[PDB]
Amino acid sequence: ATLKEVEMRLKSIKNIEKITKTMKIVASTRLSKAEKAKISAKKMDEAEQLFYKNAETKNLKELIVAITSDKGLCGSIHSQLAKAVRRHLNDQPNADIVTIGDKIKMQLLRTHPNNIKLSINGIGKDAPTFQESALIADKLLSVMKAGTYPKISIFYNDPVSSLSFEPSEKPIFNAKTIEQSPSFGKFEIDTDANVPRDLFEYTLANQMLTAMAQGYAAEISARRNAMDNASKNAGDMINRYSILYNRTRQAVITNELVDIITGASS
Amino acid sequence: ISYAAYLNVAAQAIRSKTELQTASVLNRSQTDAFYTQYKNASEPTPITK
Amino acid sequence: GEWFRDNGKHALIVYDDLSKQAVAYRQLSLLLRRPPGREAYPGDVFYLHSRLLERAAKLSEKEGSGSLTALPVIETQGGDVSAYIPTNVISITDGQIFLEAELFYKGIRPAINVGLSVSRVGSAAQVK
C-alpha cells in the first residue's frame, strides 16, 4: 500500500528471481558433471547385472533402502518416491526401512515412523561416489545385518529424460540367492572362496551407486526445472510490483503536492 | 572391513605429486556423510561414516 | 476522569478512538479556515493528543496518590502504523498493544502481536 511497503516487498522478489535463476545455471553445470557420472554408472550396470540375468537369479522380512536427498527445492523428487515406497510397504508392512537423505526420512517418518531403523545424512551436495556408496553399504552389513534378509530393495528415481524422471525399485540378492539360482551352473566359478558372499557385498555397494547416481541426476534435473519455473514466476510478480510501484510512487508525489497547493492558497 | 569397504581403502591408496589427481579425485575421497541410528522417532548419536 | 485522580481514587479512561477525534479536529479547523497541514490536519494535531494524554498520570503522596490510566485507541488503514496520526500517538504513549487481522484469523485472540507490543512501565506494575 505505502511506498516503503512496496519498495521492500518488490526488492525481496527481485532477489528471489536473481537467486532462483542463479541456481538454474548452478544446477546446469552440475548436470553436465552428473550426466557423465550417470552414464559411467548406467554403463557399469549392464556389465555387472548381466551375470545375474544369465544366471537367472530370482528371489525365494525385508530391508528397504530408500534414496533421495537432504535438499529440497527440486519439484516432487522426494514426494513421489515416498509415494512409491508407501504403495509397496502397503503390501509388506513388516519391513525395516533405511533412509538415505533427510527429505525422504521426514516424508516416511510421518507415515510409517517405526519401520525406519537407519538414516543417512548430508547426501546430495556433490555427486554420489563409491566411497559413500560402499561406506553406506558397510554400515548396512554391520548395523542392519544386511546379509540376512530374504529380500532387499533399493528405491530410487530414474531419469527418463532431462525433463522428467521415474520412481523405480530394484532387488539386491544375498549370497544364498546367488548360489541357488537356476542357471548358476552355466558359470565355472571356483567354489573355494565365497564368490557369492563377495558378489553380494560388492553388488550392495555397487547398485546403490547405480541408484544414487540416477536419483541424483533425476534430482539435478528436477531442481533446474523447479528453479527455471521459479524465475519465470518470480519475474511475473516483479511485473506486478514494478507497475504498482511506478504507480504508488506517482501517487505519493501527487498527494504531497495537493497538500502543498492547499497550504499555499489561504 | 567388508568387500566393499575393503576395495574402497584400496581405492584411496591409488587415490592418495598432486599431478594425476584432478579435482574430482580428491572429491571421490571426501564424504560429508553421517549415519544416524533410529528406534521406535530417533534413538542414538549421529556418527561420521 | 481527573476528579478521581485528584482525590486519591483511580480512574481508567478509554479514548475510543483518537483517530475519529483528530478527524473532527480537522473538520473544525478547515471550516474556520485555519491553513491546513499534512493530510489536511491542523499544524498542531500532535499537540491535540500530547496534551490530552499527558493528563493521565500517577500523582505523588503529597497529592493523595490518585491515578488516571489512559487506554487510547487508534485505527490504522491496511496495517499502516507509519501513517500520520498513529505515529503521533505512538510517540506519546508508554507502549502499545498491536492487534492484527492476520493473527485473529489464525485463532490468536486477543490478536496481539507479541513482538511489536510493549509496556514501557514493564514488570514494574505487575503482580509478582
Report the alpha-carbon distance of residue A141 to residue A197 in Å, rounded.
12
Q: Is A169 exposed, middle or buried (0-12, 13-18, 19+ CB in 10 A)?
A: middle
Q: How was this structure determined?
A: X-ray
What is residue B26's three-state secondary structure?
helix
Number of domains in chain A: 2
State the helix-helix crossing angle for B3-10 and A130-143, rounded to 10 degrees: 150
* Sequence letter at residue B4: A
Q: What is the CATH number of the domain that holds A80?
A: 3.40.1380.10
C35: phi then psi, degrees, rounded to nearest 5:
-60, 125
Do A118 and B19 form a contact (C-beta atoms < 8 A)? no
Residue A166 sits in the same domain as residue A249: no
End-to-end CA distance of chain B: 13
* Sequence letter at residue A266: S
Sheet holding A62-67, edge to edge: A166-172, A151-158, A62-67, A96-100, A116-121, B34-37, B47-48
Judged by 3 or more CB pairs under 8 A, whether A touches C is yes
Do A31 and A223 form a contact (C-beta atoms < 8 A)? no
DSSP characters over chain C: -HHHHTTT-EEEEEETTHHHHHHHHHHHHHHTTPPP-GGG--TTHHHHHHHHHHT--B--GGGTT-EEEEEE----STT-TTSHHHHHHHHHSSEE--B-HHHHHTT-SS-B-TTT-EETTGGGGS--
Report the alpha-carbon distance of residue C104 to residue C100 in Å, rounded.
6
Residue A175 sits in the same domain as residue A247: no
What is residue B34's three-state secondary structure?
strand
DSSP characters over chain A: --HHHHHHHHHHHHHHHHHHHHHHHHHHHHHHHHHHHHHHHHHHHHHHHHHHHHHT-----EEEEEE--S---STTHHHHHHHHHHHHHTT--S-EEEEESHHHHHHHHTTSGGGEEEEEES-SSS---HHHHHHHHHHHHHHS-GGG-SEEEEEEEE-SSSS--EEEEEEE--HHHHHT-TTGGGS---TTS-HHHHHHHHHHHHHHHHHHHHHHHHHHHHHHHHHHHHHHHHHHHHHHHHHHHHHHHHHHHHHHHHHHHHTTT-
Residue A163 sits in the same domain as residue A76: yes
Q: Which residues of C touch A5 (CB under 8 A)?
A: 80
Residue A107 sits in the same domain as residue A233: no
Report the alpha-carbon distance of residue C117 to residue C94 in Å, rounded.
11
Q: Is C72 exposed, middle or buried (0-12, 13-18, 19+ CB in 10 A)?
A: buried
Interface probe with A: pick from B3, B7, B22, most Cβ of A within 10 Å: B3
B40 vs A134: CB contact, 8 Å cut-off?
A: no
Among residues C69, C71, C93, C70, which one has the least CA distance to residue C81? Answer: C93
Task: Assess whether C120 carries a catalytic annotation.
Answer: yes
Residue B31 DSSP one-character state: -
Judged by 3 or more CB pairs under 8 A, whether A touches B is yes
* C9 close to A (CB below 8 A): no
Q: Which residues of A touch C40 (CB under 8 A)?
A: 259, 262
Whether the bond between C17 and the residue before it is cis, its omega within 30 degrees of 0, is: yes
Report the alpha-carbon distance of residue A189 to residue C112 in Å, rounded.
77
Report the alpha-carbon distance of residue C48 to residue C32 in Å, rounded.
17
Among residues C91, C54, C86, C81, which one has the least CA distance to residue C70? Answer: C54
CA atoms within 13 A on the CB side of A74: 27
What is residue B7's three-state secondary structure?
helix
> B9 vs chain A: nearest CA distance in angstroms?
9
CA atoms within 13 A on the CB side of A237: 16
Residue A2 sits in the same domain as residue A36: no
Spell out the domain ranges in chain B: 1-49
Q: Which residues of B touch A33 (CB under 8 A)?
A: 24
Cell of A161: 529424460
Cell of C109: 485472540
Residue with cell 527429505: A103
Residue of A nearest to B6 (CA): A134
Cell of A6: 512496496
Among residues A230, A226, A82, which one has the least CA distance to residue A163? Answer: A226
Report the alpha-carbon distance of residue B27 to residue B38 in Å, rounded.
29
Residue of B nearest to A126 (CA): B27
Report the alpha-carbon distance of residue A249 to residue A2 in Å, rounded.
9
Residue B42 DSSP one-character state: B
Do B4 and A134 form a contact (C-beta atoms < 8 A)? yes
Q: What is the CATH number of the domain that holds A13?
A: 1.10.287.80
Residue A239 sits in the same domain as residue A172: no
End-to-end CA distance of chain A: 31
C96: phi then psi, degrees, rounded to nearest 5:
-150, 155
Report the alpha-carbon distance of residue A93 to residue A115 in Å, rounded.
8
Residue A121 sits in the same domain as residue A15: no
Domain that holds residue A175: 26-226
Do B33 and A136 form a contact (C-beta atoms < 8 A)? yes
* B39 close to A (CB below 8 A): yes
- Name, in order, each residue with C-beta under 8 angstroms of A219's C-beta and a sequence gap of 6 or more: A68, A69, A71, A74, A77, A124, A157
Residue A69 sits in the same domain as residue A125: yes
Residue A45 sits in the same domain as residue A144: yes
A209: phi then psi, degrees, rounded to nearest 5:
-50, -60
Q: Is C6 exposed, middle or buried (0-12, 13-18, 19+ CB in 10 A)?
A: middle
Do A103 and A75 form a contact (C-beta atoms < 8 A)? no
Residue A52 sits in the same domain as residue A85: yes
CB C120: neighbour CB atoms within 10 A? Answer: 9
CB A93: neighbour CB atoms within 10 A? Answer: 8
> B27 vs chain A: nearest CA distance in angstroms?
8
Residue A37 sits in the same domain as residue A168: yes
Please report all neighbours of A, defined by 3+ CB atom pairs within 8 A: B, C
- Name, in order, each residue with C-beta under 8 angstroms of A157's C-beta and a sequence gap of 6 or more: A67, A68, A77, A81, A165, A166, A167, A168, A214, A215, A218, A219
Residue A154 sits in the same domain as residue A247: no
Nearest-5° angle of CA A23, CA A29, CA A31?
95
What is residue B32's three-state secondary structure?
coil
> A206 vs chain B: nearest CA distance in angstroms?
8
Q: What is the CATH number of domain B1-49?
A: 1.10.1620.20
